[PDB]
Amino acid sequence: FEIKKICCIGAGYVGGPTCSVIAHMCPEIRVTVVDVNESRINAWNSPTLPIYEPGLKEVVESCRGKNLFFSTNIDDAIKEADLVFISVNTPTKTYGMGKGRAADLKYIEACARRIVQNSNGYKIVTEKSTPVRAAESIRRIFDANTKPNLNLQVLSNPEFLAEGTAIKDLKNPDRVLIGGDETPEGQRAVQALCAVYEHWVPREKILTTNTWSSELSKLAANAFLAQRISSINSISALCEATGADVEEVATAIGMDQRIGNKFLKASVGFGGSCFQKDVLNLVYLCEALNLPEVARYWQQVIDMNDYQRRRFASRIIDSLFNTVTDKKIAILGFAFKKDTGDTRESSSIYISKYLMDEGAHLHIYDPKVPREQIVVDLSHDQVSRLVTISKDPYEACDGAHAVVICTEWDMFKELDYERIHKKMLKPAFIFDGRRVLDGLHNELQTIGFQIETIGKKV
Amino acid sequence: EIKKICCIGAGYVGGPTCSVIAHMCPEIRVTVVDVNESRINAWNSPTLPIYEPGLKEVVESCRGKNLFFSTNIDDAIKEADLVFISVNTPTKTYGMGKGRAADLKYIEACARRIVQNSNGYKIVTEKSTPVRAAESIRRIFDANTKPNLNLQVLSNPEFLAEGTAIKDLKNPDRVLIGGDETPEGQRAVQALCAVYEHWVPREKILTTNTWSSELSKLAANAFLAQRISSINSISALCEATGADVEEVATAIGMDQRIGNKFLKASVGFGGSCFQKDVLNLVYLCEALNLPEVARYWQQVIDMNDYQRRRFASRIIDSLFNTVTDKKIAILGFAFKKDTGDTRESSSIYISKYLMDEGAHLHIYDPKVPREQIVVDLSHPDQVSRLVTISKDPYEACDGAHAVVICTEWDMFKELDYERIHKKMLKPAFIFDGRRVLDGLHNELQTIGFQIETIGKKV
Amino acid sequence: FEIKKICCIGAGYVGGPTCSVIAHMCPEIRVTVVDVNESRINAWNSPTLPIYEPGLKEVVESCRGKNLFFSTNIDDAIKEADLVFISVNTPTKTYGMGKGRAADLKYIEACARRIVQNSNGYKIVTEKSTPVRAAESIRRIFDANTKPNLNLQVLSNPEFLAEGTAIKDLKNPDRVLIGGDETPEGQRAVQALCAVYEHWVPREKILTTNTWSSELSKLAANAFLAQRISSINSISALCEATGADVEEVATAIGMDQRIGNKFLKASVGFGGSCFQKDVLNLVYLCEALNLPEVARYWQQVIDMNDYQRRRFASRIIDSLFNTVTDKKIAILGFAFKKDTGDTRESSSIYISKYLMDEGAHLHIYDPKVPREQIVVDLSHDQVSRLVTISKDPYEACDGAHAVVICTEWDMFKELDYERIHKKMLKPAFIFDGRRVLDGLHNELQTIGFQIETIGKKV
């Protein structure tokens, strides 16, 4: 009927911030986040949260201990909950079928079973990572382990938040998506969860589908975004060959309202822990379902990304006459995008890897990524021989043959380039992988730099 | 200051654009010229050779005052400040790039005509904007200089859609103008801007180099085509998993970074713009040794081709792989609703696949003339033996095994399907290739139909 | 309950001989064979039957007009029948999907519909050509066109007879196979048809399966037989390369009772209208069902057959120094196997075709095949220029460079080879494609022949 108590299994990004927001917006609902990881739970109950998000500390502390609880007691929280969120990791498989592409359902299934063991009467169970087949899997387990007077409803409610802006995104979503059965039972359940979201979210922005659609939506959304980036990246190679300019072309394209102007910035390649993972998973799913045409269609988004990184590296190596042994090269930017410390699937790792294959002496600078993270990312002895992590950008550039800008940190616009030039070996190259130095081209060339950028003919 | 305009080419590009300019700039003399005398006479008649809503009023508003249609090319060039080249760029039919490359023969001949008839300073602006057009005109001008002859070459693509040409010309999303990044080019661009600023706000006017304006027109259409192919690829996936493509497209679309336009799954995209532009883009990548980029874009075409085939082969399979002497209704022949245009219509391809099976097709479309349906299906006896063009949908469905909906005409929503069912052979099939019958499935299933549709599992 | 009246739709090999035997063995049953082809029906009612089979004329005439009837009145025969056989042609598709491989269900479906229109109360309907999906197709049609008090049961009862021995095979079958639903209705029906066969056939030899199994059995049986031939043919190529002898190897193989000694005679290639058609159909079915591994497995049976014919032809052409223009060559045997006039998929057609490609003057002899059939088989002007049909074998060999034995007619063993040699050009070649001349090798070599055979090293 009404949702008064909520259990969230999983205290990560998927479930921590969401349930904190729910308990901040609905004073009447007892929200209990549970996790087997004790050190994670103690961090949520500390004055410093295990997740860095703007305004998150304030949201939690305004209701923690009131109607928001972080507990290591999973069993009991399930027992007394009207609604159980499942938001646990779904890491990519590391061995077996779909190795490196398919998602691993083991934690979802283990949570599904713990729910049965600890559960009585009516409950609504909503999965939040939403890989394809999660809901089907949870359904199979519930149906095969029933009890008298046990009625578990299964729903799907994917998270669309982006890290860095989790709270704004949670308070002001483009849409909320809930999936459930096209049954009179399933309808009863979708309504219940809707009523929770309607505390801060208009009904206009709440969309109800079937469980399969919510699963495929999350995946497809991220695939379309990634496609946009590879599309404009493919154009960038064509601009380099013709004398067109990818920033002019992208702006022209974006002013068509049927297309819109977002996700059209050409780059050395997309990164982050969402896009490649989701496109690879989509490809796997199509192969497994005997849809090879659709699989090869989506594979191109990955192949284009790979090609964009390789041709960038290759252009650097060719400018150096195909010899980079013992030459110092500055890598400016290691984060996968600016204004974050996240390096997952960062394009800098890949470019670095290519230059290390050439025996380059890499001096790497990034204002936010820790030295420890960079070392681990490049390793898998080569790192010890070839990689220096520079304290400052000038240190990285001192006596370098080339400067390679890999991340679009704003500070790179405003470095003293005349000084950098003096201390570089000649010819001094600047390779701009992010169009971050647009407008400075005439000045850099008169300073003496050979300056090159994605999507611009030499 | 531009006060005299000559437009070579009285087609879809030149006619409407120059009529609008003249209707917005009383002070500018605008002369549309063409060698084809009968066309010119038609522009000077009460029956223009182009049917666009609003066009007759625009023409008659200023024709004779400051808008003129003439067969005298030479005197129109001689006097003009600005010369638009608005001639056809047909796809090559033989030779290198047969079926994919644009043929620049008319653009070159105009460039040669312009030099023959010009002295002093003139701006020449290419409007069809195929890739290399600007370079071509520039090569003819540069090799044929006269003392005191200073021609500037600009590129200015049209973005109108037939049916809303006037609305798109009076309120464009953007105006694109390409020119050299030089003082000459800048001056020439400025002059053309000043013309458009009589009715177009300066924020919506974008200036670029001439390569960018060419690439932009090609790229925009490719991006649009790619979106439809992406959503069609999702539709196959939905059919295999139990997701619904409309649900999914609506979820994807409410992401403000993706936008909700061009996300409707269909039997395949059609029209004179998309396949042509993507094919030309593929061709240009091969020629520029960008095979990676060529196969990336080729996928947009292959996915379109795959979506049509799997739709057809689903019809053929449901009829146990024999359609010989079987009556099949085809509802809709235009490439989309509300038009009589059949170019690259999916109906053509579906009809073609069923004809290879010896199907007796009965085709109904409320706007496409019977001679256009016949001529499209005759392209390289089969049409003679197998095809009937019906005058009402009920004559087409009388005694048919299957009803194929290929074009999203609204009237198909509202037919008497109880009536149709009774007169169909059993089992009676409806294959809905446009999702036109969504919401009605339970009505039709209980009437007795086997009803199938794109992006919905059976 | 009991079967007293039987209607057979189709008066060919499938239904003519079977129903004649049924009416000869069951005096109590009224058997009525019907066909739209009037000239076929009048032939069955004449003293000379349209089908040549040993003892067939006697079987028909002992009961024709008593309890066996051949009628052009399809409609009425259906009305009064307890049991309706469907045994009409299922020709390979000539256009569309599965062209040249898939079977065409059009006549089965047309018979299914005529049955509904003309049928009341309870009837059992048994299809006898049994291509895959036939029964499913008939079932779909019956279910979609029901009436009050209409109960049609669908069964499958494939024919295994071989032409030439139809009657012996019908009176003494290895097995009878009937397929029907695993329902209490389907069981009722299978029993009824069993009781008919039990008039001359022991219950031990009557096998009951599901409708899908009977369909796949017919196909798979013929595929296994064809596989056996290609297997021993593959070995024959290996014997030629090693010095083993394929007749020794085949005999050794066959004496393993787990293998048995049938269908192990190596040849130039299998033929007849059953094997290639059934293997091609099996391959198509696997492709259509997304079983590409199984498809390529079975394709090898066809590829091996093709390879065996080609390498045989190629050996002839190489022995002639790759020039056969205007050289006379005797083709002895045109029938696909000995003791018949049937040339369907005969290996002689293929070998002939290869030599005609070389501009050979073919003199063709066969004791049973008509001249008219040979001409039609080789045609599709080349035949007029290059092909002579010889009255006698000696005429064929007179002034020939080579003698090619393509069919295993016994008479070829006993020709006067010393005479043939005298009249041949030298070197005189004999190419034995059937091991028909085994044991004569020493004599032919001392006569002066260069004699070669399948599966024997030079």
DSSP codes of every residue in C176-232: EEEE--SSHHHHHHHHHHHHHHTTTS-GGGEEEE-HHHHHHHHHHHHHHHHHHHHHH
**CATH architecture observed for domain C243-458:** 3-Layer(aba) Sandwich (3.40)
Whether the ω angle into residue A292 lies within 30 degrees of 0, i.e. cis, is no
How many degrees, rounded to 5, is the angle at CA A208 between CA A206 and CA A214? 105
| Residue extent(s) of CATH 3.40.50.720 domains in chain B | 1-209, 242-458
Note which residues in 88-147 of chain A have CB less than 8 A from chain B: 132
| Rounded-to-integer distance, Cα A385 and Cα A143, Å | 58
The listed CATH number (3.40.30.10, 3.30.360.10, 3.10.450.50, 3.40.50.720) that belongs to domain B1-209: 3.40.50.720
d(CA A258, CA C285): 44
Q: Please state, in angstroms and rounded to a whole number, the distance separating the CA atoms of residues A169 and A179.
A: 20
Domain(s) of CATH 1.20.5.100: residues in chain C: 211-242
User: Measuring CA to CA, which residue among C59, C77, C61 is closest to residue C22?
Assistant: C59
CATH 1.20.5.100 domain residues, chain B = 210-241
Are residues A24 and A57 in contact, defined by beta-carbon separation less than 8 angstroms?
no
A346 is known to lie in a ligand binding site: no
Residues of B in contact with A225 (CB under 8 A): 255, 257-258
Identify which of B438, B390, B387, B446 has the alpha carbon closest to the alpha carbon of residue B421.
B446
Q: Is A187 on the interface with B (CB under 8 A)?
A: no
A221 contacts: CB under 8 Å, gap ≥ 6: A160, B251, B252, B255, B258
Homologous superfamily, domain A1-210: NAD(P)-binding Rossmann-like Domain (3.40.50.720)
Helices (H), A258-369: 275-288, 292-319, 347-357
Quick one: closest CA in C to B355, which residue? C96
CA distance C311 to C340: 26
Pairing of strands B82-85, A387-389: unpaired
Q: Tell me whether residue C274 is one of the annotated catalytic residues.
A: yes
**Residues carrying CATH 3.40.50.720, chain C:** 1-210, 243-458
Q: Which residue of B has its CA nearest to C112?
A: B426
CB contact under 8 A, B357 and C97: yes
- Rounded Cα–Cα distance for residues A91 and B403 (Å): 46
B residues 220-239 lying closer than 8 A (beta carbon) to A: 220, 222-224, 226-227, 229-230, 233-234, 236-238
Antiparallel, parallel or unpaired: β A30-34 and A68-71:
parallel
Q: Which ranges in A321-400 belong to alpha helices (H)? A: 347-357, 371-378, 382-386, 393-397
Q: Are A33 and A70 in contact (CB under 8 A)?
A: yes
Annotated ligand binding at A159? The verdict is yes
* Residue A112, CA distances (Å) to A109, A142, A185, C364 in order: 5, 7, 19, 78
Taking CB atoms and an 8 Å limit, are A297 and B233 in contact across chains? yes
Please state how this structure was obtained: X-ray
DSSP C332: E
The C-alpha of C137 sits at a distance from chain B's nearest C-alpha, in angstroms, of: 7
Q: Determine the residue of chain B that is closest to A254 in CA distance.
A: B220
Name the residue among C95, C109, C143 with its Cβ closest to that of B356: C95
A211-242 is a CATH 3.40.50.300 domain: no
Q: C-alpha angle with apex B185: B179 to B186, nearest 5 degrees?
A: 105
Instruction: Report in angstroms the alpha-carbon separations of A87 from A272, B254, C314.
Output: 20, 23, 69
A280, two tokens: 């690879």
| C129 CB burial (10 A radius; 0-12, 13-18, 19+) | buried
Contact map slice: A 46-85 vs B, CB within 8 A: none
Helices (H), C54-102: 56-61, 74-79
**Active-site residue, selected from the candidate residues B6, B122, B127, B158:** B158
CATH architecture assigned to B210-241:
Up-down Bundle (1.20)
The answer, for A251 touching chain B at a CB cutoff of 8 Å, is: yes
In this complex, is the C-beta atom of A288 within 8 Å of any C-beta atom belonging to chain B? no
Residue environment code for B44-81, b if the CB has 16+ CB neighbours within 10 A, otherwise e:
eeeebbbebebbbebbeebbeebbbbbeebeebbbebb
d(CA B266, CA B269): 7
Measured CA to CA, the distance from residue C338 to residue C413 in angstroms comes to: 13
The answer to whether the Cβ–Cβ distance between B324 and C104 falls below 8 Å is: yes
Pick the residue from chain B with its C-alpha nearest to A285.
B237
Residue among A210, A258, A263 whose CB faces B261 most closely: A258
Give C360-409 as a 3 state SS string: CEEEEECCCCCHHHHHHHHCCCHHHHHEEECCCHHHHHCCCCEEEECCCC
Contact A60, A68 (CB under 8 A): yes
**Of the candidates A69, A95, A56, the residue with the CA atom closest to the CA atom of residue A8:** A69
The one catalytic residue among A128, A218, A327, A456: A218
Q: How far apart are CA C98 and CA C104, in angstroms?
A: 9
Using CB atoms, pick whichever of B229, B236, B299 lies closest to residue A291.
B236
Fold of B242-458: Rossmann fold (3.40.50)
CA distance A160 to A218: 7
Residue A221 has its nearest CB partner, among B208, B255, B288, at B255
Q: Which residues pair with A179 in a beta bridge?
A: A156, A209
Q: Which value in Å is the resolution of this experimental model?
A: 2.3
